[PDB]
Paper text:
Synaptic vesicle glycoprotein 2A (SV2A) represents a novel antiepileptic targeted by the prescribed levetiracetam (LEV, Keppra®) and brivaracetam (BRV, BRIVIACT®). SV2 proteins are critical to neuromodulation and neurotransmission, and a well-established role of SV2 is as a crucial regulator of synaptotagmin trafficking. SV2A protein is predicted to share structural similarity with the major facilitator superfamily (MFS) transporters; however, it is not classified into any existing solute carrier (SLC) family. The overall SV2A architecture can be divided into three parts: the intracellular helical domain (IHD), the transmembrane domain (TMD), and the glycosylated luminal quadrilateral β-helix domain (LBD).
2D classification revealed that SV2A protein existed in both monomeric and dimeric states, in the absence of any ligand (apo). Intriguingly, no obvious opening is available on either the cytosol or the lumen side of SV2AApo TMD, indicating an occluded state captured for the SV2AApo structure. For one protomer, the typical MFS-fold 12-transmembrane helices were built into the EM density of higher resolution, referred to as the canonical form (C-form). In contrast, only 11 TMs could be modeled for the other protomer, due to the lack of TM12 density. Furthermore, the peripheral TM9 swung away from the TMD core, instead of packing against TMs 7, 10, and 12 as seen in the C-form, to engage with the neighboring TM8 of the C-form protomer. We defined the configuration of this unusual protomer as a non-canonical variant (NC-form). The dimeric interface was mainly formed between TMs 8 and 10, with additional contribution from TM9 of the NC-form protomer.
Residue numbers in the entry:
A (entry chain B): 133 to 404, 415 to 709
B (entry chain C): 133 to 404, 415 to 734
Write the structure that this text describes.
């Protein structure tokens, strides 16, 4: 009777899909689909902000706490682990919790946790709270695509479902713009009663998590998804959901909702201790999720599932590329760009002369002063090494970005300077008198901020230029159909000649990565939209959960093996 | 009655339009259509070269034939006003005198005055030569679009009119290639005339006129648009041009002899003193154009023209960014980089060693020189201030970009210099007098030649890189739904505002403007195709030229804004453009 029961269930699912599609067609206009797409764009941009921050801003924002390289570099992989664990668990639980409730709690749990993280201290506390943010955010993509694909009709599924890349990219660009803006400017941190001179990235995390509360406020009015109610077999709630979504067309032009209600009731008739209790229903939910995973792994969907597993594995290369790989190349390019401006000062002092010209970006090697005396000299990016000064009574010498290594001074007095005894490392404290001097601070991220904002701008412009490469590619894989291969080959050949001829600069790499990012993101949307079409809605949310989980595992393991493969 | 007569006339117009498109679909597609495509692509190459020389090669005004800066700003504006006048007048003429006649006259005038501009010397003469060249070139785009639309039907109109952006952009590519290859390297610019000097600037201007004269040479063979021949009653010529295009198409596909009689039957329905002559011609043509313009605002086409002006206003803010905003920002960034890059030395003092070395970018303040016999001195972009020199005279020394102030020369005399009293002001001098020089008409040879080389090479690479991105975007625009090309254009305008408000670095600007300009130039022609389709042939070129002229009006007033108040007002036009695009939300989609 097992085979007959399975065949009967398959027939039930087929007739349920047909009926669903019937309600989809009887709805009428798809402007409510536009509304849902715009609303869920906020969740998309929140996920984009999260992936942007973890890919780019996290390694450098930690310098206020001076974590080790094996701490800050690996922190990205811990946060990726957090989001993939969230993906596993909550994609699995999406088919049972309630997609609207699940999405709302997913947004809120990361939003409030980032709200708390933006002010707290602690070396491992930041890692823990970013794990919390990642486990909150990693489930956004599967939930959002399932939730939006339920509402959208079968015919208009392709275009209006694959146009979701726009909000993700706008979120990435907006997060990049905030990173460029807030990080270098210290006017946003004005406060009273708080002596902590923390860097602006504490405010940056808050302002980048703000789109999460945007999304929460957007979704607090949207109703629940009806097809989940149909899967549960519930009748009345899906009836109000469909009546509400049909009220949009009722306002538009007016439709016979009573007749549609008759079809809805017809298909309803066709489709017939607190702590202890937490574990009591948790074990049942986990067992049902395990059974769902075993069923989706069965002979019905084994070949297809493994086929995509291979497809994402060969596609995940572009994913970790565009998320984390080229950052090293672009930071190296920015470093060699910055190296062309700095200069070495071997000592330009002259006998019995007064020096007052402003000087910046100095690294000293052998620049000793022979009984010199200067007043009002401006020094920026101070780096003294084997450049001892004798009888240099400096007054009103405003200075910033002061760091020392292997240096000494004799009868040297500094006033109104940023010099501090904490920064003195591997040097002898000779004549290190800073009485009545301006209060110095440890450098921490101060020596990286100049490289921080400019790389934020280069990332911002890269993600901005990905969008024009996204539009044409999305139309390419939206409209052409079966023969997209010739257009794709033309695109790659043209962009190859593009950077080949255009390689007589340093923006050639920027253009190359922008074009490749556009192509890869369009392909990602194409894979998402085709996977939506293939899997049935009964097990689709858990599907996407496992798919995103495997994608993130592959993305992590890429760099995890590259760091020990080539170096 | 009048209403009955007008209704009958409109019905006859529609029936003849249907017969015309049926006869066009008789002809088919073949070698003739693409040969005409290349012939008109020569004209669009000329138009693109003219636009490049207007926009990217503004700085040559201050580099050759030095004049006051008050007269230097008109170079980028008077030519645009000339393009206004040309679009207006020559669209109005092309709808009455014939597109081929007016296009030929446009390209003839452009070629003649572009050739004139190179050899002339005076600044006013150059200004009028360039103004006339702009007037001649302004009649290219609308007249060529109409003249090439009257040879195609709806079967392949969209693609084969979209592919003109390739030629429009390759014109700028070729112009930039000349700018980079000729302007910096004086070797190619032959100094054959001992009594006739030759700057690379005039040679570059002269050689940029090759596409115009080549369009003239290769376009006189192409016959006129048969639609005008049908309109004015010249039926035999229409029949023979249709026969010729038919014969050309059959050799590629289909037997020719069968359709001859069918085409003849299809086309046989329509058959059968200087002062005084010029006065009569003016009286007829001006009255006809005035009547056409007043009828274009009538109820038959009032709403469509009113929406189309706004739709074009949406386009003008991207044309601006591609054409005039990018070169100005590149030049200003290079200027501030040059200002940042300075070298200060107390003095080049060496012991008994000849100073025969090439050095540049010398700016010395408060430098005292030890007296010695100076030999081999060379001055290139060298300036002095607060410095004194004693016994430092040299014979036959080259000078360039030399400006001296608040510095005195003691017993120092230089020869073969390009210095005048208007540069050396507010300073003392003892036993110093510069003679045996080339004083006269200022000629800044190699003036910022290294800076000019970078600018021209960057413009060349930006255009050459836009070219394949333009290929891709033009190919992919066809797949877009023809009702949503307008929305795509609006999206590209919005991202144009994004780039323009978020562009502040050299390589950043180059990459972002190239990647944008690909798709933007691809999406520009959507408005052209839209205006071609919904404007009737008797009203096509007049209205199209009017709308193009309003586009040039928006561009020239943006230029006026940047010439009157810029620096603090970098982002004000961006906000204005964003608001203008947002305002036309419904009009950009409402297509009757």
């Amino acid at each position: 009777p097992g085979g007959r029961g399975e065949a009967q269930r398959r027939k039930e699912r087929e007739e349920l899909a047909q009926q669903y599609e019937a309600i989809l067609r009887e709805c009428g206009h798809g402007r409510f689909q536009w509304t849902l797409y715009f609303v869920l764009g906020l969740a998309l941009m929140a996920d984009g902000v999260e992936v942007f921050v973890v890919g780019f801003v996290l390694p450098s924002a930690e310098k206020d706490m001076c974590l080790s390289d094996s701490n800050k570099g690996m922190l990205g992989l811990i946060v990726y682990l957090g989001m993939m664990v969230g993906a596993f668990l909550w994609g699995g639980l999406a088919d049972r919790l309630g997609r609207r409730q699940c999405l709302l709690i997913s947004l809120s749990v990361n939003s409030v946790f980032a709200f708390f993280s933006s002010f707290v201290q602690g070396y491992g506390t930041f890692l823990f709270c970013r794990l919390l943010s990642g486990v909150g955010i990693g489930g956004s993509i599967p939930i959002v695509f399932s939730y939006f694909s339920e509402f959208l009709a079968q015919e208009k599924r392709g275009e209006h479902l694959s146009w979701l890349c726009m909000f993700w990219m706008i979120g990435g660009v907006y997060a990049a713009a905030m990173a460029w803006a807030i990080i270098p400017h210290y006017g946003w941190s004005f406060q009273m009663g708080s002596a902590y001179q923390f860097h602006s990235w504490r405010v940056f995390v808050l302002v980048c998590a703000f789109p999460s509360v945007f999304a929460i406020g957007a979704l607090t009015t949207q109703p629940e998804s009806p097809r989940f109610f149909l899967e549960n077999g519930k009748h009345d709630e899906a009836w109000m959901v469909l009546k509400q979504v049909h009220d949009t067309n009722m306002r538009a032009k007016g439709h016979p909702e009573r007749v549609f209600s008759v079809t809805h009731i017809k298909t309803i008739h066709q489709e017939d201790t607190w702590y202890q209790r937490w574990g009591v229903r948790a074990l049942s939910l986990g067992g049902q999720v395990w059974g769902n995973f075993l069923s989706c792994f069965g002979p019905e969907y084994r070949r297809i599932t493994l086929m995509m597993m291979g497809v994402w594995f060969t596609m995940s290369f572009s994913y970790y590329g565009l998320t984390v790989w080229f950052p090293d190349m672009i930071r190296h390019l920015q470093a060699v760009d910055y190296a062309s401006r700095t200069k070495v000062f071997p000592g330009e002092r002259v006998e019995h002369v007064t020096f007052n010209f402003t000087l910046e970006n100095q690294i000293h090697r052998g620049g000793q002063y022979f009984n010199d005396k200067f007043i009002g000299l401006r020094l920026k990016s101070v780096s003294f090494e084997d450049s001892l000064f004798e009888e240099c009574y400096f007054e009103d010498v405003t200075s910033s970005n002061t760091f020392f290594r292997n240096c000494t001074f004799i009868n040297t007095v500094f006033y109104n300077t940023d010099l501090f005894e904490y920064k003195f490392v591997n040097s002898r404290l000779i004549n290190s008198t800073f009485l009545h001097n301006k209060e110095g601070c440890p450098l921490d991220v101060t020596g990286t901020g100049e490289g921080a904002y400019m790389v934020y701008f280069v990332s911002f412009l890269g993600t901005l230029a990905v969008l024009p490469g996204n539009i044409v590619s999305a139309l390419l894989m939206d409209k052409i159909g079966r023969l997209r291969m010739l257009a794709g080959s033309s695109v790659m050949s043209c962009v190859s000649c593009f950077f080949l001829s255009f390689g007589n600069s340093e923006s050639a790499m920027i253009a190359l990565l922008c074009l490749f990012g556009g192509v890869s993101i369009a392909s990602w949307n194409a894979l998402d939209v085709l996977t939506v079409e293939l899997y049935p809605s009964d097990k689709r949310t858990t599907a996407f959960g496992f798919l995103n989980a495997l994608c993130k595992l592959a993305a992590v393991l890429g760099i995890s093996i590259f760091t020990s493969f080539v170096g």
